[PDB]
Amino acid sequence: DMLFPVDNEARQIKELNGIWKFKRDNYYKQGFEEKWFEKPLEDVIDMPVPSSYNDITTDQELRDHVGWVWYERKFAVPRLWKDQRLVLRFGSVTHHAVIYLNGKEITRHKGGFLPFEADVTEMANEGENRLTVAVGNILEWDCLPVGHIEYMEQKFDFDFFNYSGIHRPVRLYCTPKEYIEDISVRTTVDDKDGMVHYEIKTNAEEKFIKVYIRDEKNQVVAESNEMKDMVLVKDAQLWQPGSAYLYKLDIYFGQDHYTLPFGIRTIQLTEKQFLINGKPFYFKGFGKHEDSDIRGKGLDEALNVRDCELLKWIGANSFRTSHYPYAEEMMQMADQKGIVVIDEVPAVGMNFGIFTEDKVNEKTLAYHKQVLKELYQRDKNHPCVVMWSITNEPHSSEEASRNYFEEVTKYIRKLDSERPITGTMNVDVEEDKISQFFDVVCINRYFGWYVGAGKIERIYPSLKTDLIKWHEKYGKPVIVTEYGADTIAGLHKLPEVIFSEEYQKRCIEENNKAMDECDFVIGEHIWAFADFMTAFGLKRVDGNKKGIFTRERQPKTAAFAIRERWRKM
Amino acid sequence: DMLFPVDNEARQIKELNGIWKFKRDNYYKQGFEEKWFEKPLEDVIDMPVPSSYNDITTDQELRDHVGWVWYERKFAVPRLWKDQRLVLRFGSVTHHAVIYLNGKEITRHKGGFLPFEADVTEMANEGENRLTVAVGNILEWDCLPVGHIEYMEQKFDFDFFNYSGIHRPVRLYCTPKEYIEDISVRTTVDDKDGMVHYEIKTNAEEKFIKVYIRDEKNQVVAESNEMKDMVLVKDAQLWQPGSAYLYKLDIYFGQDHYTLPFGIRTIQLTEKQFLINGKPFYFKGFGKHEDSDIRGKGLDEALNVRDCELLKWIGANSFRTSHYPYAEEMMQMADQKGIVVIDEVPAVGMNFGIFTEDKVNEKTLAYHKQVLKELYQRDKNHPCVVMWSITNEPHSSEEASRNYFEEVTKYIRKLDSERPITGTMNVDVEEDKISQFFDVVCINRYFGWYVGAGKIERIYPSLKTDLIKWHEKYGKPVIVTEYGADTIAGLHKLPEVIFSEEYQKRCIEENNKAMDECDFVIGEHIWAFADFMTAFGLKRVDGNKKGIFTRERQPKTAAFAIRERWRKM
Ligand SMILES: [Ca+2]
Numbered sequence A, B: 001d002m003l004f005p006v007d008n009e010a011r012q013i014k015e016l017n018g019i020w021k022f023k024r025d026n027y028y029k030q031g032f033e034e035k036w037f038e039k040p041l042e043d044v045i046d047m048p049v050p051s052s053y054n055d056i057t058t059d060q061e062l063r064d065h066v067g068w069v070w071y072e073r074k075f076a077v078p079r080l081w082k083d084q085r086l087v088l089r090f091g092s093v094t095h096h097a098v099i100y101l102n103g104k105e106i107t108r109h110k111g112g113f114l115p116f117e118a119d120v121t122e123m124a125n126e127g128e129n130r131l132t133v134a135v136g137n138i139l140e141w142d143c144l145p146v147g148h149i150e151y152m153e154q155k156f157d158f159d160f161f162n163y164s165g166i167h168r169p170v171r172l173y174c175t176p177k178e179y180i181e182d183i184s185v186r187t188t189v190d191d192k193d194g195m196v197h198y199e200i201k202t203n204a205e206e207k208f209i210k211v212y213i214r215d216e217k218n219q220v221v222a223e224s225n226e227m228k229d230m231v232l233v234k235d236a237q238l239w240q241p242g243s244a245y246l247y248k249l250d251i252y253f254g255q256d257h258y259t260l261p262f263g264i265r266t267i268q269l270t271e272k273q274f275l276i277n278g279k280p281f282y283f284k285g286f287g288k289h290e291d292s293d294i295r296g297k298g299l300d301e302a303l304n305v306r307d308c309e310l311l312k313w314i315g316a317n318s319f320r321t322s323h324y325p326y327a328e329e330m331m332q333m334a335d336q337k338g339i340v341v342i343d344e345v346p347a348v349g350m351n352f353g354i355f356t357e358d359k360v361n362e363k364t365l366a367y368h369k370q371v372l373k374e375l376y377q378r379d380k381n382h383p384c385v386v387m388w389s390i391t392n393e394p395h396s397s398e399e400a401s402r403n404y405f406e407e408v409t410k411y412i413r414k415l416d417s418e419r420p421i422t423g424t425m426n427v428d429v430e431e432d433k434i435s436q437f438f439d440v441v442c443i444n445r446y447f448g449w450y451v452g453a454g455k456i457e458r459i460y461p462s463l464k465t466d467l468i469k470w471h472e473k474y475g476k477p478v479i480v481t482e483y484g485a486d487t488i489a490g491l492h493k494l495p496e497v498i499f500s501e502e503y504q505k506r507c508i509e510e511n512n513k514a515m516d517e518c519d520f521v522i523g524e525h526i527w528a529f530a531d532f533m534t535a536f537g538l539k540r541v542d543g544n545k546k547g548i549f550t551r552e553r554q555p556k557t558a559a560f561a562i563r564e565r566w567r568k569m
């Protein structure tokens, strides 16, 4: 149950962002042992919310902290909210949360990239309250992303910095006590007419509802009094890639009111094409990251607008949420700009045996299904989402992974019978044991970088050969979901060398030549959109330098050649 | 007399380069007053030759030195040289030289970019000798480049750093006592046959001489026993831009032997065109500088080859020896590679009243004529030189500059009737007073940088309008001899901004569009070839950054766009 909070005449949002008080444990779980939540925090510093905490201070100990940290602020409940339902919402807490209201625990959460909330109607006092949030960053074999602890040092095999903090907005909001809990929308098209299937869940199903469908002019085009209905939109304005159209499911229920934007669009996979509204779609874009200077993974909407301007400028039509769900604000923006999205759960780091009883096991599986349920509940109504990605680069050569991912694939397909399912490959085509469960084959391939570094002449034959093998083995359309080269801005050389701006351009260009000679490729996603931070390592010059743009969102040389190609496509 | 030294059966060269001993004056002219030359130098450091001294040490006092420094080394005269004529040659000493041999002064020279020599046949001893060289860097109103001293601080209004030292090889060489002193070669073409007019001077004009003209496979194609003659070369292999062919004037005189490469090629200026061998030539290239890391203006032949590879790669066909004569090794390289050269004397810095009796006056004028004579005598036989430039950016709006440059132009025309004469403009077209004396009008224009900085849309109309005015006022073909923009490697921005790599490309692009619409433009020379060092100033980020290549000879982004254009012309 996770409708995005709204403001209208009936519902109201109180943002709890700004500056909080903050302190870290000085030994493992010190805050829980000493019950720091039972009184205000002492010996604290300021910490912005939303933001990672790791890059804010000058303190290497805080940057590299392993374990739990403690946030605290105060909030008020006005007299005017006296008889309302009160909800405290967290867009995310990375990775693990324990929430305390006035010294008492009210909820917990596992998973750093999906929202959660707590009903505090009967617990919050009028006037001042104290909100205390314990934030833990430890990843074990039953978390997503996967990791483990050694003796404490945090180990993991994914390539992005394990930022921790309150990365997304914290909201206290009110609704009437009889209210709209959940909404599902599915759409079909018969030539010119759209059909809108909706289902609305309330906590008083016998009472009266009024449902409108409004166009972008806010004009009513359909109307009903049923909580579940199928309604026809004559001459429907379809939601198109690069040309969004959003209708509004506008719902009056008792004293309550909720308005849900949605797009009318169809998806169909053929043998070798990806069809949106019947017309072939070729993915041009990037896997991204929630990453920028100072604030780590913290939501930054000005950064988001800049990134969308860059995506439009360079001719991209799509992105993948590597390697975790992004903020709903980004998903709303993609809905509005007509950007096509591959939505991914954080099942990353399942690589180096990995699928064994003492590591990635049935407990990991059950949590993997739960994360998918939550992702679906949050994003099921976004027209921008066209595909679910259930994993990034698992060690799928292991025979034990076959049963694991058959279970995961069956689960998401039971939740959602309409969008294709996929996941990205890094093992050899000959060894993979899971891609047969997918509708689209996605491969991460770094010819000219991790294979044959510097050997420009070998990139084109290498990727073409591999692509054909992937198509011959599975007979499905193929997306190259990652390829590129680390590139230091300002590093030029003639003849070109790895890390130079010229090499990045040539590397991408030869990979593209291989893709252009295949008839079953339905997309190219360059890695990476922008330089981002990684865990420290000798192959990472202050992070991952595969960005086509710098971390400050300025283009390297290759960006202009990619634009010339994508704008002609 | 200044024939380039050669090695053969009769003549021998001894290089005196390597590591010398070095010391600077601690007060003005300390070394002269204390007669340091009378005994070996004491309290010295090592200094390499050839090289500037400014960038070698970690000492700011030496880098910014004003006045004189002292070089010394030892050389040997072999027993085997017993009865030969002995000559000490300096390729250059910047700017002023006093030469001592075994403690006695033997010659002086004024001007930092042209060679000079001294006959030491009767003054060097068999075995060890001591060679001492005083090197002065002070420029006054009668030097070229122009400058002046204020109270000691050196002032000047040219860009580049006032490097000083022994910048070109020092050579002791030997010839027989009766020998070839000078050679002048001129060529004409009648349809398919070439006519080689030569004049040879010796110090015994009555003695027998034998003169061969040899082709590139060293086979005799013409023969004569005259000191001055006119011999036919049937079916002559012409020297062409991009395809050099060099004949050899191979001269046997008594015991002496000298071999002089030369090329057969015609130059003709028409209304609107610059014809070489009767075919229109469009200059594509750069003004350069003698400048690189560590060694300042020191000759570096490895760097010279790299620059010619770069010029070839980028599609250039020419350069101008911006603001002073270059080393002969580079002129020889241009002869062999077919690179067309504009050869320029150091009349730079006559700008801020400049042409007054207390500044640039008749003493300056007479020295300017002498430098031209020395330049002509050195470079008259190079087929690569197609045009003389007698000044760079003088304040030619002053009425007094008219008689000055009419006199300079008429002098150079008497020395050489075959090659066109020019000089580069920076004053406004309405105020210029000297360009009517030239055969080609050369303008330095920085629209988008020094005028309307950052205003990309104003570049094309401004340049086209100025170009038309120059053509209409003088009716001669036009070269844009400088244009461009400072650019920090690695500085990228979208939208572009001055100093970014993207801006340099667009600025050059928009200037090129203006030139392409003008049927009277016969050349474009971008400023600059490579980043180089300047006197310190708030507009100069560790030198002039207008290079298309960095100072380490690697390309910035714009280099690739220039290459596409120049290579399809
Ligand atoms: Ca959110």
Ligand SMILES: [Ca+2]
Pocket (backbone or CB within 6 Å): B091, B092, B168, B169, B327, B328, B329
């Ligand atoms: Ca020389």
